[PDB]
Amino acid sequence: KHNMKAFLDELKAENIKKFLYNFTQIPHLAGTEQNFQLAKQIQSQWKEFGLDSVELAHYDVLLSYPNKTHPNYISIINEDGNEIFNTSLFEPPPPGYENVSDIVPPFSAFSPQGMPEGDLVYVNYARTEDFFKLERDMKINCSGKIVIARYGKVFRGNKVKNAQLAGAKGVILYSDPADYFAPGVKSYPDGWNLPGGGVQRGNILNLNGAGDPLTPGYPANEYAYRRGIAEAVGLPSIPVHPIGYYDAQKLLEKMGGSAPPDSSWRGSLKVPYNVGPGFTGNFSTQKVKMHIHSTNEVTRIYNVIGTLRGAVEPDRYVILGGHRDSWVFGGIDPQSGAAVVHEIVRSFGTLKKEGWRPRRTILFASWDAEEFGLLGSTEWAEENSRLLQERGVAYINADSSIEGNYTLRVDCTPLMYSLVHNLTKELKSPDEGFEGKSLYESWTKKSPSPEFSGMPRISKLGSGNDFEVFFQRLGIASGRARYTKNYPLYHSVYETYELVEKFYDPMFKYHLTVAQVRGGMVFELANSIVLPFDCRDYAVVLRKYADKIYSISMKHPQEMKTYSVSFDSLFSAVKNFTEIASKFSERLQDFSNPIVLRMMNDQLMFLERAFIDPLGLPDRPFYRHVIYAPSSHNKYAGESFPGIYDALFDIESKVDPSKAWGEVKRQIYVAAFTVQAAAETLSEVA
């Protein structure tokens, strides 16, 4: 028969391996010819595999590249203007790739041009709290200084936003061995650690969901009206560049001024980690000079969109999407995920060739320019927003399949928790010591839930990947899964096929397990008669998030008294959601009537949709989900009740407490209303 087991059994580790090798022999940088050719290859293969239609959707978006004849670098310059030390012009290429063309040298995408010269200040991870510590506690002024920050902890775009607001005139990002060199493992090529010459590429935008910087709200098609550069969304105002730890050592070793405030500011290099500003006595007249000559350029990008039409509900879409563009070879990010998507399409197509079709339409996407700000997925979702609004059942992301080899990682809407628990109980664990056990068993043992005995940890969605437009802008139930650790070579030339094959997943069994999870989720979402969402799981978390935000507010009891700040309405809404969801579940379990079913399937599908506020969150119009947004301090992390959270954040420092607490009360009202409105979508319809 054609059931989920047939689909799952058709997936093969050796196919995922062959596809990964095929996708990682040359760089596939967004906007390059190589990446367009790979798009055409994937289009051809998805057609071969049996999809009903496979098209390219192209857009012309703002990208950023170094100038090939005017390289980016950083110097220490003496008082005479002699550059006495220069950072590297490229990463030493790995064995057998020393003759590979078109490896983009390390750079921070979308940096403006400039040659700022000045004194260094070391800012730890450049987090909001690191700048609070510098200004407020240490009285160190970053204004007109060049800041040097270690990568880690938060999205690099937030570091740059923080540095710019502190008054910095430039930012140097570096990888500290504390964060990118695991003890007892060798550097690439002899292990999976970052060598001293390795460097992390990546964009430094603050788009807040906008997509292409020049066309927020609308797809960057052939007749698009573009903003001028000065009005573009999210671009940094100061030059930025990344370096490795051999080069960082040379910039940090001379640092003087103030000592690091505590051990959490010290990395692993043999330097004092002095904050500065500037260098110790003998070197006080030396400065650091950046030379950044990259250019932003409107460039064509190509998504591949594959359709497998539903037999019964072709106007309901379950979407499996992940990106295809890479910084260099993309051995993990994204090709470990793209290879898994490729094998999932192959398996679905095998069933289709035998006469099967899923109940609902499945869309498969190979997104372009994810690395430059989620551009491909976001432009396509802007172009198709009305179709997605009214027809989108779910989005399953499919970027990197592995970031470790220890256990499963799942981040998803509460609506998918039950689906994920049930599916993983039917899959085999690939882990050593768990042979013959379920993936649910191994995952729950290795990654226990912090609140529930005998359950595994599932995280909320943050951002920094292609589900952002679907989840936080459009309110379509979204999820992701991969294998994880209890990674060093991220965005470096060393992230190759060999890295994966030798050190992460030699048998491709973790890749196969991830294909089973992502593919099984898609299968159930596209084929189950009743959509596999449990609204009651949203009720449970909403109470947890309400308790959490109330607890933050209760750090300020006097102000809550003074300004009459009550969470009563939010708890009332959550209580109402809990009751209504319980009754809806009874009806769903207790209802031959396809209209009641589809009416009920529409209530399930539109439930995530009901958490959207069309006015957006404050100053972030494309983050419209009221329960979840990317943290304003770290795009990778999710924040719950973000509008109330941001209203409360650092509120003791606000000069007008009446106004600040009034805005907290406004956000409580918006959240209580949105939770009650979403509950009411589950009430009897008439």
Ligand X SMILES: O=C(O)CC[C@H](NP(=O)(O)OC[C@@H](NC(=O)c1ccccc1)C(=O)O)C(=O)O
Ligand Y SMILES: *[C@@H]1O[C@H](CO)[C@@H](O)[C@H](O)[C@H]1NC(C)=O
Ligand Z SMILES: *[C@@H]1O[C@H](CO)[C@@H](O[C@@H]2O[C@H](CO)[C@@H](O)[C@H](O)[C@H]2NC(C)=O)[C@H](O)[C@H]1NC(C)=O
Ligand U SMILES: *[C@@H]1O[C@H](CO)[C@@H](O[C@@H]2O[C@H](CO)[C@@H](O[C@@H]3O[C@H](CO)[C@@H](O)[C@H](O[C@H]4O[C@H](CO)[C@@H](O)[C@H](O)[C@@H]4O)[C@@H]3O)[C@H](O)[C@H]2NC(C)=O)[C@H](O)[C@H]1NC(C)=O
Residues with a known catalytic role: 370, 566, 602, 625
Amino acid residing at 111: S
Write down the least CB distance from residue 354 to ligand U, Å: 32
Write down the least CB distance from residue 216 to Ca ion, Å: 6
Q: Which residues are within 8 A (CB) of 480 and not within 5 positions of it... i.e. 6 or more apart?
A: 396, 397, 398, 399, 410, 411, 412, 461, 465, 467
Q: Is 259 in the site for ligand Z (CB under 6 A)?
A: no
Q: Which of residues 635-674 bind ligand U (CB under 6 A)?
A: 672
The full DSSP string for 303-320 is EEEEEE--SSEEEEEEEE
Q: Stretches 1-9, 160-168, 221-229, 485-493: which one binds a copy of itself (CB under 8 A)?
A: 221-229
517 vs 523: CA distance, rounded Å: 10
Q: Is 419 in the site for ligand Z (CB under 6 A)?
A: yes
Q: Which of residues 392-431 bind a copy of itself (CB under 8 A)?
A: none
Q: Stretches 84-92, 316-324, 403-411, 614-622: which one binds ligand Z (CB under 6 A)?
A: 84-92
105 vs 92: CA distance, rounded Å: 10
Q: Which of residues 19-78 bind ligand Z (CB under 6 A)?
A: 22, 25, 41, 44-45
Q: Which is nearer to ligand U, 37 or 572 (CB)?
A: 572
Task: Say if residues 195 and 188 touch (Cβ distance below 8 Å).
Answer: yes
**β partners of residue 319:** 363, 395
Q: Which of residues 573-612 bind ligand U (CB under 6 A)?
A: 573, 576
Amino acid residing at 363: L
Give the one residue of 35, 203, 208, 640 binding ligand X; rule: CB under 6 A: 203
Q: Is 212 in the site for ligand X (CB under 6 A)?
A: no
Give the one residue of 106, 211, 414, 520 binding Ca ion; rule: CB under 5 A: 211
Q: Which residues are within 8 A (CB) of 462 and not within 5 positions of it... i.e. 6 or more apart?
A: 411, 630, 631, 634, 635, 636, 637, 638
Compose the 363-382 pattern: x for residues touching Ca ion by CB under 5 A, - for all others.
Answer: -------------------x
Task: Say if residues 24 and 508 touch (Cβ distance below 8 Å).
Answer: no
The full DSSP string for 623-685 is --BSSEEEETTEEEEEEESHHHHHHHTTGGG-S-HHHHHHHHHHHHHHHHHHHHHHHHTTS--
335 vs 23: CA distance, rounded Å: 6
109 vs 87: CA distance, rounded Å: 18
Q: Which is nearer to ligand Y, 65 or 417 (CB)?
A: 65
Q: Is 215 in the site for Ca ion (CB under 5 A)?
A: yes
Residue 370 labelled as part of a binding site: yes
Q: Which residues are within 8 A (CB) of 629 and not within 5 positions of it... i.e. 6 or more apart?
A: 472, 617, 620, 623, 638, 639, 642, 643
Q: Stretches 81-89, 122-130, 544-552, 602-610: which one binds ligand Z (CB under 6 A)?
A: 81-89
Residue with tokens 């030798």: 502
Residue 382 labelled as part of a binding site: yes
Q: Which is nearer to ligand Y, 485 or 555 (CB)?
A: 485
Residue 371 labelled as part of a binding site: yes
The DSSP letter of residue 140 is -
477 vs 392: CA distance, rounded Å: 8
Q: Is 399 in the site for Cl ion (CB under 5 A)?
A: yes
Give the one residue of 28, 287, 480, 625 binding Cl ion; rule: CB under 5 A: 480
**Binding region for ligand Z (CB under 6 A):** 22, 25, 41, 44-45, 83-86, 418-419, 422, 532, 534, 589
**Binding region for a copy of itself (CB under 8 A):** 52, 217-219, 221, 223-225, 307, 309-310, 312-315, 317, 361, 383-387, 390-391, 568-569, 594-595, 598-599, 602-603, 606, 609-610, 613-615, 621, 662, 665-666, 668-670, 672-673, 677-678, 680-681, 685-686
Return binding residues.
156, 203, 215, 218, 323, 333, 370-371, 379, 382, 399, 463-465, 480-482, 490-491, 635-636
**Binding region for Cl ion (CB under 5 A):** 397, 399, 480
